[PDB]
Amino acid sequence: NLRSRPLARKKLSEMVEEELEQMIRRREFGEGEQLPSERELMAFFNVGRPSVREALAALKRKGLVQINNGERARVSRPSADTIIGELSGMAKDFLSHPGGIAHFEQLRLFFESSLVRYAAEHATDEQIDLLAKALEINSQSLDNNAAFIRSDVDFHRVLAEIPGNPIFMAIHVALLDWLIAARPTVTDQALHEHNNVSYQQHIAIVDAIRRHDPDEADRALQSHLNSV
Amino acid sequence: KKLSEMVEEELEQMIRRREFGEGEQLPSERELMAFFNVGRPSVREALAALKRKGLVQINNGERARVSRPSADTIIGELSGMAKDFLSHPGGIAHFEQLRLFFESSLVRYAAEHATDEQIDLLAKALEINSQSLDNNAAFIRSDVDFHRVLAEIPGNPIFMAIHVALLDWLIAARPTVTDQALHEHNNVSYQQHIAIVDAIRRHDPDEADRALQSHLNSV
DNA sequence: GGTATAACAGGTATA
DNA sequence: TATACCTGTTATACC
């Protein structure tokens, strides 16, 4: 450890991991694979090989580096996706106990209402083409299977991408994944009429956005979320 | 892929299914490894990940246990997230903007189902909120209590958790606080809350949203 | 004596 | 072709 300090009983792995943390915080490395390999650091610190592996693995969990296969660690910063990855541990309890299912629906409804209100209020002359091509590519009836579902979720994503906030897209993807993960026994009984109703509601929504009237858009969105 | 994450999620869902309660009820990890056809460092990495999460307790050579409280992981995630500040100077305001997208989803709900049982509660809350006198201690406590009783109107435990999380996040983020400017800030805040509760009584969510937007713009 | 923690080499998919 | 991930082995201090 370049300082002659064993620290065996007090877990010497903490010493090397905090030394690596300090060396990274000292702005002595770049943003990629500037850090050496495992054997180089092992020989430089006169320690074991599995210790450095555990250190890096713990560091990745803490959200500091990233490794894939046959490449050194790439130092980065913990973004919004890292927080969502570290979370979701208690999400199973919510779907386990009877409640919470309506709470997630209410949260999603509030989020979508807020974002559609912001989009209708800050409606520029360029984002109209995005929603136009979205409703155009989601207008034809060619595949009544899962293609319409992915088209609808892509339309929702491009609608949520209007503000331009990295945390917004992250939480949107997280909520959509947590919602589609709790859809058991999906059957194709009345999904075609559901697709037609969704198309009509999207047409009404874009018409209300063009006319600058969030009331009708909010009513159509509430009706769509109540019809499920 | 990586075996580690597989057995990690397996033991996570096992401890979530309430298969083992308090104490050292887990079997020997050697025969677990022999049955799962995994490696020794994988189990050590899984235990280290669980210790970093804050669910098990390993000191010397004893076995792991369960952890019912969840306050350690909260401050852990707080310290881990409150770091991305020097990268984006104004992007933090985006996070503040997120708070907007939350509060605008609250003042427009009082006119939905609140009839009289919540009106008395918010009135008796704002009574003490206005009776408060201290600028740094009483006014901040009154403001957070008003925000809590506002978030508790729909009756949702997730909303309260999100609100307190945003509160502690902004508290850890903002490093400098004022006293003279905060006085007029909370003054205008409760002056606008008066109009907010007036519009709530009159069943007009537009005026409440406008007052909230003006309060957020006043900073 | 059981416990975790320590060290080493060897075979193989992959960029 | 060079890389790291996974699997093989044994030695040692403490309760």
Residue numbers in the entry:
A (entry chain C): 21 to 248
B (entry chain D): 30 to 248
Task: Kindly provide excerpts from the paper associated with this entry.
The Escherichia coli GntR-type transcriptional repressor, NanR, regulates sialic acid metabolism, but the mechanism is unclear. Analogous to other GntR members, the NanR monomer has a two-domain architecture, comprising an N-terminal winged helix–turn–helix DNA-binding domain (α1–α3, β1–β2, green) linked to an α-helical C-terminal effector-binding domain (α4–α10, tan). Here, we demonstrate that three NanR dimers bind a (GGTATA)3-repeat operator cooperatively and with high affinity. The effector, N-acetylneuraminate, binds NanR and attenuates the NanR-DNA interaction.
We used the (GGTATA)2-repeat oligonucleotide to solve this structure as NanR bound poorly to the oligonucleotide with only one GGTATA repeat. NanR binds DNA in an asymmetric pose relative to the DNA helix. The C-terminal domain closely matched that found in the NanR crystal structure (RMSD = 2.1 Å), showing that DNA binding does not markedly alter C-terminal domain architecture. However, the direction, length, and position of the α4-linking helices are altered when compared to the crystal structure. In contrast, when bound to DNA in the cryo-EM structure, we observed that the α4-linking helices are oriented in a different direction and adopt a more extended conformation (green and black). The α2- and α3-helices of each N-terminal DNA-binding domain make contact at the major groove, whereas the α1-helices interact with the DNA phosphate backbone. Comparatively, monomer A is better resolved, particularly in the wing motif and the α3-helix, which allowed several of the putative DNA-binding sidechains, such as Arg73, to be assigned in the model. Despite the assignment of these putative DNA-binding residues based on these inferences, it is important to note that the resolution of the overall DNA-binding region (~5 Å) is insufficient to resolve specific DNA base pair contacts with the (GGTATA)2-repeat oligonucleotide. However, unlike FadR, where each N-terminal domain binds a palindromic DNA sequence symmetrically, NanR binds a repeat sequence with one N-terminal domain of the dimer engaging the consensus (GGTATA) sequence and the other N-terminal domain binding an adjacent non-consensus DNA sequence.
